[PDB]
Design a protein around this motif. Structure first.
Motif, PDB file in Angstrom:
ATOM      1  N   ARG A   1     -41.326  22.350 -17.721  1.00 22.34           N
ATOM      2  CA  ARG A   1     -40.308  23.645 -17.737  1.00 22.34           C
ATOM      3  C   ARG A   1     -41.539  23.711 -16.069  1.00 22.34           C
ATOM      4  O   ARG A   1     -40.957  24.122 -14.612  1.00 22.34           O
ATOM      5  N   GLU A   2     -42.507  23.589 -15.986  1.00 19.48           N
ATOM      6  CA  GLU A   2     -43.981  23.910 -14.489  1.00 19.48           C
ATOM      7  C   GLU A   2     -42.835  22.776 -13.892  1.00 19.48           C
ATOM      8  O   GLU A   2     -42.727  22.980 -11.779  1.00 19.48           O
ATOM      9  N   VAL A   3     -43.329  21.696 -13.784  1.00 20.96           N
ATOM     10  CA  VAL A   3     -42.119  20.202 -12.910  1.00 20.96           C
ATOM     11  C   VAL A   3     -41.518  21.242 -11.711  1.00 20.96           C
ATOM     12  O   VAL A   3     -40.805  20.287 -11.525  1.00 20.96           O
ATOM     13  N   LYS A   4     -40.406  21.053 -13.664  1.00 18.61           N
ATOM     14  CA  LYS A   4     -39.050  21.440 -13.246  1.00 18.61           C
ATOM     15  C   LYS A   4     -39.117  22.643 -11.991  1.00 18.61           C
ATOM     16  O   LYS A   4     -38.338  22.158 -10.467  1.00 18.61           O
ATOM     17  N   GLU A   5     -39.914  23.590 -11.866  1.00 18.75           N
ATOM     18  CA  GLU A   5     -39.966  24.752 -11.338  1.00 18.75           C
ATOM     19  C   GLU A   5     -40.690  24.506  -9.800  1.00 18.75           C
ATOM     20  O   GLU A   5     -39.574  24.699  -8.693  1.00 18.75           O
ATOM     21  N   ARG A   6     -41.404  23.468  -9.881  1.00 20.83           N
ATOM     22  CA  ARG A   6     -41.796  22.653  -8.930  1.00 20.83           C
ATOM     23  C   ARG A   6     -41.018  21.904  -7.781  1.00 20.83           C
ATOM     24  O   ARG A   6     -41.354  22.646  -6.576  1.00 20.83           O
ATOM     25  N   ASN A   7     -40.400  21.121  -8.618  1.00 19.87           N
ATOM     26  CA  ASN A   7     -38.811  20.342  -8.295  1.00 19.87           C
ATOM     27  C   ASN A   7     -38.172  21.162  -7.137  1.00 19.87           C
ATOM     28  O   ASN A   7     -38.442  20.774  -6.327  1.00 19.87           O
ATOM     29  N   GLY A   8     -37.762  22.672  -8.197  1.00 22.29           N
ATOM     30  CA  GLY A   8     -37.048  23.108  -7.311  1.00 22.29           C
ATOM     31  C   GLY A   8     -37.695  24.066  -5.597  1.00 22.29           C
ATOM     32  O   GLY A   8     -36.909  24.245  -4.941  1.00 22.29           O
TER      33      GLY A   8
ATOM     34  N   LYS B   1     -49.968  24.627 -14.423  1.00 23.62           N
ATOM     35  CA  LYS B   1     -49.725  24.886 -13.114  1.00 23.62           C
ATOM     36  C   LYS B   1     -50.923  24.030 -12.303  1.00 23.62           C
ATOM     37  O   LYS B   1     -50.061  23.184 -11.488  1.00 23.62           O
ATOM     38  N   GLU B   2     -52.434  23.727 -13.026  1.00 24.21           N
ATOM     39  CA  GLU B   2     -53.371  22.829 -12.341  1.00 24.21           C
ATOM     40  C   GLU B   2     -52.645  21.396 -13.305  1.00 24.21           C
ATOM     41  O   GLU B   2     -52.996  21.057 -11.697  1.00 24.21           O
ATOM     42  N   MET B   3     -52.081  21.587 -14.106  1.00 19.65           N
ATOM     43  CA  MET B   3     -52.001  19.839 -14.329  1.00 19.65           C
ATOM     44  C   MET B   3     -50.845  19.212 -13.344  1.00 19.65           C
ATOM     45  O   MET B   3     -50.886  18.370 -12.877  1.00 19.65           O
ATOM     46  N   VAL B   4     -48.954  20.286 -13.372  1.00 20.43           N
ATOM     47  CA  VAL B   4     -48.769  19.617 -12.414  1.00 20.43           C
ATOM     48  C   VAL B   4     -49.196  19.587 -11.036  1.00 20.43           C
ATOM     49  O   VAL B   4     -49.181  18.579 -10.827  1.00 20.43           O
ATOM     50  N   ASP B   5     -50.089  20.669 -10.962  1.00 22.59           N
ATOM     51  CA  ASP B   5     -50.555  20.337  -9.428  1.00 22.59           C
ATOM     52  C   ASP B   5     -51.416  18.838  -9.080  1.00 22.59           C
ATOM     53  O   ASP B   5     -50.822  17.956  -8.020  1.00 22.59           O
ATOM     54  N   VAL B   6     -52.298  18.027 -10.155  1.00 19.15           N
ATOM     55  CA  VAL B   6     -52.438  17.657 -10.123  1.00 19.15           C
ATOM     56  C   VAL B   6     -51.845  16.128 -10.534  1.00 19.15           C
ATOM     57  O   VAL B   6     -51.348  15.024  -9.395  1.00 19.15           O
ATOM     58  N   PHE B   7     -50.699  16.326 -11.079  1.00 18.89           N
ATOM     59  CA  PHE B   7     -49.328  15.527 -10.873  1.00 18.89           C
ATOM     60  C   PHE B   7     -49.149  15.028  -9.564  1.00 18.89           C
ATOM     61  O   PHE B   7     -48.275  14.100  -9.433  1.00 18.89           O
ATOM     62  N   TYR B   8     -48.571  16.502  -9.303  1.00 18.17           N
ATOM     63  CA  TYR B   8     -47.528  16.236  -7.617  1.00 18.17           C
ATOM     64  C   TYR B   8     -48.684  15.849  -6.534  1.00 18.17           C
ATOM     65  O   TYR B   8     -47.637  14.897  -5.740  1.00 18.17           O
ATOM     66  N   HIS B   9     -49.810  15.315  -6.911  1.00 22.29           N
ATOM     67  CA  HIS B   9     -50.754  15.121  -5.857  1.00 22.29           C
ATOM     68  C   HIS B   9     -50.841  13.568  -6.261  1.00 22.29           C
ATOM     69  O   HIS B   9     -50.688  12.745  -4.707  1.00 22.29           O
ATOM     70  N   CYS B  10     -50.530  13.292  -6.949  1.00 17.67           N
ATOM     71  CA  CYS B  10     -50.982  11.999  -8.036  1.00 17.67           C
ATOM     72  C   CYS B  10     -49.622  11.113  -7.662  1.00 17.67           C
ATOM     73  O   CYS B  10     -49.314  10.324  -6.230  1.00 17.67           O
ATOM     74  N   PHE B  11     -47.961  11.683  -7.718  1.00 21.01           N
ATOM     75  CA  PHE B  11     -47.155  10.884  -6.802  1.00 21.01           C
ATOM     76  C   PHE B  11     -47.550  11.355  -5.201  1.00 21.01           C
ATOM     77  O   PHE B  11     -46.916  10.153  -4.806  1.00 21.01           O
ATOM     78  N   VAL B  12     -47.522  12.304  -4.478  1.00 21.72           N
ATOM     79  CA  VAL B  12     -47.851  12.372  -2.893  1.00 21.72           C
ATOM     80  C   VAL B  12     -48.351  11.130  -3.110  1.00 21.72           C
ATOM     81  O   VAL B  12     -47.980  10.238  -1.782  1.00 21.72           O
ATOM     82  N   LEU B  13     -49.556  11.088  -3.387  1.00 23.08           N
ATOM     83  CA  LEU B  13     -50.371  10.241  -2.817  1.00 23.08           C
ATOM     84  C   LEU B  13     -49.864   8.294  -3.131  1.00 23.08           C
ATOM     85  O   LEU B  13     -50.192   7.949  -2.555  1.00 23.08           O
TER      86      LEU B  13
END
Lengths: 92, 92, 92, 92
Positions: free
Chosen positions: C83-90, D58-70
């Motif tokens: 859910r968080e990933v999708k929210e972040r995506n939006g 939130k923090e885990m998805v934050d880690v994932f987001y930055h890993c994808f940016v990387l």
């Protein structure tokens, strides 16, 4: 004491004893030491959140020990660090 | 020098100056300091891999500064750390 | 695939096999998993600076695997993460 | 969803909007992203120990987001990661 620890680590870099952990670190190199620092830092965070003071001290010293090994490995003089500590002290 | 840094950090815990970074850390507490330590540790790894000695020194001292702030915050005496450093020295 | 990995980790939490690494993690608990995440994160940094793509991939997936084990251990549903990933995506 | 996030991050690398955080990361480069990953990893540890599930997510998805940016920054295809996840799944 910090200087004593550094000197001892330096002495191991010149007179290698494969049986020793410090020499094991020097042989594996930079990447091994850095991994240890990251792991140890996580251990300090975990120990601090557990409110385990004895463990915080052990892990923090563990971090310091590996940082010193890293200095010796990258050929960075301890006094360079101490100069920075003093400069930082003055700022405060 | 390390003792000097610690004493200075301790003096800030008793005589707060909201303008100071050390007091900002004490006000935000444990979790803020720990986050800084993790961030700084990553910076040491990055700096080391970049072979930037000056940066390694700055970041390593940054890690030490935050560890000392953490000690003061958790009410852990510096001598406890120094005892551990000496014990560790003897083992080596 | 991420969901498949999570489901598999969940199945191990209910049907323990002491021989498995996942069960070893669950038995040691939260603090062990967290230490692994910190260590693995440091390995990702080191691998990335070494420009070793294969290693970056292995370590990144290692981080993800341990994060999922941590979710299962803390009883956090995967969909909450999604859910968080999708929210972040939006937001992007 | 993970693929959607990655695609979106990829689209930002080609069509830069200085106002966006993703482009800010690409401009600062590899070292900035890695620092974020280390910081976020520490945040996950702290959040987990605080038993704050929402924050862990939130923090885990934050880690994932930055890993994808990387990944995008280092030009590493997402499917390479997915292959590794599937291989890892099979092993389990």
């Amino acid at each position: 004491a910090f200087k004593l620890l550094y000197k001892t680590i330096e002495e191991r870099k010149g007179s290698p004893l494969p049986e020793s952990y410090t020499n094991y670190l020097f042989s594996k190199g930079e990447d091994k030491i850095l991994k240890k620092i990251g792991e140890e830092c996580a251990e300090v965070i975990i120990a601090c959140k557990n409110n385990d003071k004895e463990e915080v001290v052990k892990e923090m010293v563990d971090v310091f020990y590996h940082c010193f090994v890293l200095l010796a490995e990258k050929n960075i003089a301890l006094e360079d660090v101490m100069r920075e500590v003093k400069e930082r002290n003055g700022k405060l």
